[PDB]
Amino acid sequence: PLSPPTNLHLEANPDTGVLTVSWERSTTPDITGYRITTTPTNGQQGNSLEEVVHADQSSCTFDNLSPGLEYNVSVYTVKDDKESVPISDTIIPEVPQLTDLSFVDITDSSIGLRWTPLNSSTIIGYRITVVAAGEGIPIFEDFVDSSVGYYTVTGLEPGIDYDISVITLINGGESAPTTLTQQTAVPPPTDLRFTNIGPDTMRVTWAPPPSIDLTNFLVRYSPVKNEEDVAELSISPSDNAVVLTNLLPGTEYVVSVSSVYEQHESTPLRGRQKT
Amino acid sequence: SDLIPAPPLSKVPLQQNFQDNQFHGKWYVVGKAGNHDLREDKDPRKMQATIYELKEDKSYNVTNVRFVHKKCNYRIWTFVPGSQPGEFTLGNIKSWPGLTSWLVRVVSTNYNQHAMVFFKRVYQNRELFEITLYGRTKELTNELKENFIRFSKSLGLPENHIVFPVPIDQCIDG
């Protein structure tokens, strides 16, 4: 008989939407080519496709199969007007996941999300989940339609890591989750102030971030000329000022104040002052 | 980072003949113990409240209430009845990526005074568990608090993993 193909392999790439069918070529010496078919196993869903390749080829592609449907794939060895018994297998192509989820407009209580909505016509929406990374506590869940690629998560706490996921949805299935960790901002102090200036000392003052309970403030300072010479002070969250001692006369210093919650610190508030 | 292994469930009893309609309402968090390392902020912990609303489908609308960073913070979960009365899991657990397991079990209560609740979950292949001593008021008997300590220790948790939060007035009453 005409010997069928062997070693049938089916690879559905969800990012490209393409099914690649491969096989080991027939042992029969003088063949025309191969005929490959695509047939949904659920008789109420999808439709059939057919592909044809040359005798020296051992793969073919099919695009625009429906994610989440089961398909029987058959490969037939072709010899003029004659065909081998097929080799067959089933595959369920995955739902595509988002590949460019990014974060934007990060604040102390809010996180903005952006992504490119996928171009797959059976996608009917996205699921957004927000989980507190430290404890695995679910925080928030919502749904957006298939054409939306933006979302603002609100009502969060500052200085906290959140696992944020966007899952692509079809009727009756979903993609693997696109999950990323994003920390909420620790709010910086504002309005750096320098008073009581002497040869060796200076009073550093700032405005605390409102309505937050910091672990501490963290004061860093170093000479402008040699900036690898950094000293570090830990200040109580209830204090808005510190007196810096043991300084050099006629010298310009860079000073930063950073809010700190649970080891996570704010962007620095920075200013220069000359003794 | 490091975790005390979860106790086998043979070690966690279940309140017999649990009455969902009597567990209903506000419970204050008088004591709590967990398997995660506790960082001390240079601050004692403030008391929280947890409200269990019973629904027509016999599930609970659970609302945790906290006074953190000078605001009121609310968090809501849906607890659905597990295999037995007194047991609960999370409605729609397959909604949450990486969260593969979630168990709540009412260890013991008298409904009008005190409760001990055991929570277990697996998130991203890490097993976390807690025990809460709940009270109908903000304070409980020494005997009861001692009982909770004794029970927590029986689950493998050391003394210093146990906290009794300080009673406060913000958020939790209103």
Side-chain angles (χ1 to χ4, degrees), chain A residues 140-153:
Chain A
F140 180 76
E141 179 190 34
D142 208 356
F143 296 79
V144 297
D145 78 34
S146 79
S147 71
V148 165
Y150 43 81
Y151 199 86
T152 316
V153 177

Side-chain angles (χ1 to χ4, degrees), chain B residues 87-105:
Chain B
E87 276 179 298
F88 302 89
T89 182
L90 195 60
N92 298 310
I93 192 164
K94 317 229 84 168
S95 297
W96 313 95
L99 186 79
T100 50
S101 166
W102 178 296
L103 177 54
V104 182
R105 173 178 287 211

Side-chain angles (χ1 to χ4, degrees), chain A residues 127 129-131 134-141 157-158 163 165 167 177 179 211-213 261-263, chain B residues 36 39 41 66 68-71 73 75-77 90 92 94-97 99 102 121 123-124 126 128:
Chain A
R127 191 170 82 252
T129 66
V130 180
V131 172
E135 323 196 69
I137 289 300
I139 298 301
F140 180 76
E141 179 190 34
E157 309 140 87
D163 290 338
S165 304
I167 301 91
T179 298
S211 295
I212 193 187
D213 280 329
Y261 176 77
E262 265 196 302
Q263 210 84 81
Chain B
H36 67 270
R39 279 195 291 168
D41 323 287
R66 290 182 310 175
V68 80
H69 300 294
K70 290 143 184 179
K71 310 165 210 288
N73 182 255
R75 295 184 302 197
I76 305 155
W77 304 283
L90 195 60
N92 298 310
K94 317 229 84 168
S95 297
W96 313 95
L99 186 79
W102 178 296
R121 66 200 173 274
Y123 184 63
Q124 305 189 324
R126 294 173 78 245
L128 307 149

Side-chain angles (χ1 to χ4, degrees), chain A residues 63-172:
Chain A
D63 32 44
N64 298 328
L65 297 188
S66 275
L69 291 193
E70 195 180 49
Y71 292 97
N72 203 26
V73 185
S74 307
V75 192
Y76 299 78
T77 310
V78 193
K79 159 98 191 183
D80 299 311
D81 42 39
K82 231 85 167 160
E83 286 184 343
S84 72
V85 149
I87 186 161
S88 301
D89 199 7
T90 58
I91 187 159
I92 311 170
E94 290 166 290
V95 184
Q97 74 178 107
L98 297 166
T99 48
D100 71 344
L101 171 67
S102 65
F103 306 111
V104 158
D105 299 322
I106 298 158
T107 73
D108 61 295
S109 74
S110 201
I111 292 163
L113 291 62
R114 298 295 179 273
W115 65 89
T116 302
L118 300 155
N119 190 41
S120 195
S121 64
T122 70
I123 292 169
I124 45 69
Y126 297 89
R127 191 170 82 252
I128 296 115
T129 66
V130 180
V131 172
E135 323 196 69
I137 289 300
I139 298 301
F140 180 76
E141 179 190 34
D142 208 356
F143 296 79
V144 297
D145 78 34
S146 79
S147 71
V148 165
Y150 43 81
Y151 199 86
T152 316
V153 177
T154 54
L156 311 172
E157 309 140 87
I160 293 289
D161 286 343
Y162 292 100
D163 290 338
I164 299 174
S165 304
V166 188
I167 301 91
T168 309
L169 311 162
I170 60 165
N171 282 334

Side-chain angles (χ1 to χ4, degrees), chain B residues 15 22-23 27 106 108-116 134 136 140 144:
Chain B
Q15 173 65 39
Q22 293 184 58
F23 191 75
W27 286 99
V106 176
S108 68
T109 174
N110 69 355
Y111 305 109
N112 62 3
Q113 288 182 14
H114 60 86
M116 269 202 286
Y134 286 131
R136 286 303 190 175
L140 284 173
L144 286 179

